Design brief:
Blueprint: E1 9-11, H1 20-35, E2 39-43, H2 49-62, H3 65-71, E3 87-89, E4 99-104, H4 113-116, H5 136-161, E5 181-187, E6 199-200, E7 206-212, E8 218-223, E9 229-233, E10 236-239, E11 247-251, H6 253-258, E12 268-271, E13 277-284, H7 311-326
Parallel strand pairs: 1-2
Antiparallel strand pairs: 2-11, 3-4, 4-5, 5-13, 6-7, 7-12, 8-11, 8-13, 9-10, 9-12
Helix pairs in contact: 1-5, 2-5
The structure holds delta-(L-alpha-aminoadipoyl)-L-cysteinyl-D-alanine (W05) and fe (ii) ion.
Subunit structure: Monomer.
EC number: 1.21.3.1
Keywords: Antibiotic biosynthesis, Cytoplasm, Iron, Metal-binding, Oxidoreductase, Vitamin C
């Protein structure tokens, strides 16, 4: 007997346009959801999301164990020391069910100043062989720019929601330096299902991934129509219903930092469900040196005691802590 969570569907199309009052009315809906369960679905987002699903299914289902070693992150392949973030995250049959492929900003090439200077969190994407996966790199790169465009529009809504000018976050979310990532997650069907891949909550619920706050400004998530997400509320954990036509949005712990917990980063987790499904998050992260002053929209004056925190240190530390709390993925 678990409840459904209030996860309103908000038409974000006005954030792409120039009707200011219409943008305010969207911002009011984002303010309301951000202060309630902390989730909403963005609809009328303009992304070709059936193609995203199909191309991702194609990749996941045609990639071979050989390819996966050749693309693997440092945790699965020691030869691959630079890859802490970007690459393949392998399955372990009998033990670990999930697997995935993470990629970063496509403008991180050997000549980008940030990979010349070896700045942490910045990596050059690895890719499969073009003729084994025809069109995949081109598809994936363009998806990165499509969701970047969406996320950019959402962030104008968050800014307006908070009483700011609309470019308040978005001006620091730039194609040249953003540390945003796409992750293409596969959660497979299996029996026998490997028991070491299931965790049990304090309430008995079986899980594929335990409670956590996201490491992001916001998170912009496509998922297949299989129900799996729960958010923690004052009244206990609630089910987030699936909607494969929409993007599930929520704040991460950096928005909570920037707003003195006014927009909280909702605590959530993933139920274990034995079904073939996709989780494709885009983590909206700012540039390495972005350091917005924390504010407080509770206060007549808007002043916060919190100290600024540069996005790169935030992210490097947060990613590492997520792995320590909830395991290597
Ligand atoms: C939405 C999706 N998220 C996840 O699996 C979890 C929790 S938000 N996220 C992560 O592991 C963080 C990956 C960061 C990525 N490698 C990067 O370098 O940026 C899910 O749980 O299905
Ligand atoms: Fe999450």
């Amino acid at each position: 007997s678990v409840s459904k969570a209030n996860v309103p569907k908000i038409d974000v199309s006005p954030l792409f346009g120039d009707d200011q009052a219409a943008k305010m009315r969207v911002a009011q809906q984002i303010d309301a959801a951000s202060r309630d369960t902390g989730f909403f679905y963005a609809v009328n987002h303009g992304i070709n999301v059936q193609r995203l699903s199909q191309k991702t299914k194609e990749f996941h289902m045609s990639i071979t164990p050989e390819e996966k070693w050749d693309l693997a992150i440092r945790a699965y392949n020691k030869e691959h020391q630079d890859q802490v973030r970007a690459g393949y995250y392998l399955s372990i049959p009998g033990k670990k069910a999930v697997e995935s492929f993470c990629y970063l900003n496509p403008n991180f090439t050997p000549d980008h100043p940030r990979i010349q200077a070896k700045t942490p969190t910045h990596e050059v994407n690895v890719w499969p062989d073009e003729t084994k996966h025809p069109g995949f790199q081109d598809f994936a790169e363009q998806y990165y720019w499509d969701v970047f465009g969406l996320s950019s529009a959402l962030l104008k809504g968050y800014a307006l929601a908070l009483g700011k000018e609309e470019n308040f976050f978005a001006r620091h979310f730039k194609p040249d330096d953003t540390l945003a990532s796409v992750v293409l997650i596969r959660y497979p069907y299996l029996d026998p299902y490997p028991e070491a891949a299931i965790k049990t909550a304090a309430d008995g619920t079986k899980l594929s991934f335990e409670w956590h706050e996201d490491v992001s400004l916001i998170t912009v998530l496509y998922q297949s129509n299989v129900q799996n997400l729960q958010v923690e509320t004052a009244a206990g954990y609630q089910d987030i219903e699936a909607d494969d036509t929409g993007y599930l949005i929520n704040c991460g712990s950096y928005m909570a930092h920037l707003t003195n917990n006014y927009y909280k980063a909702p605590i959530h987790r993933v139920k274990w469900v034995n079904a073939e499904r996709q989780s494709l998050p885009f983590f909206v992260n700012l540039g390495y040196d972005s350091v917005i002053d924390p504010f407080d929209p509770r206060e007549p004056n808007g002043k916060s005691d919190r100290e600024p925190l540069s996005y790169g240190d935030y992210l490097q530390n947060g990613l590492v802590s997520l792995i320590n709390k909830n395991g290597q993925t």
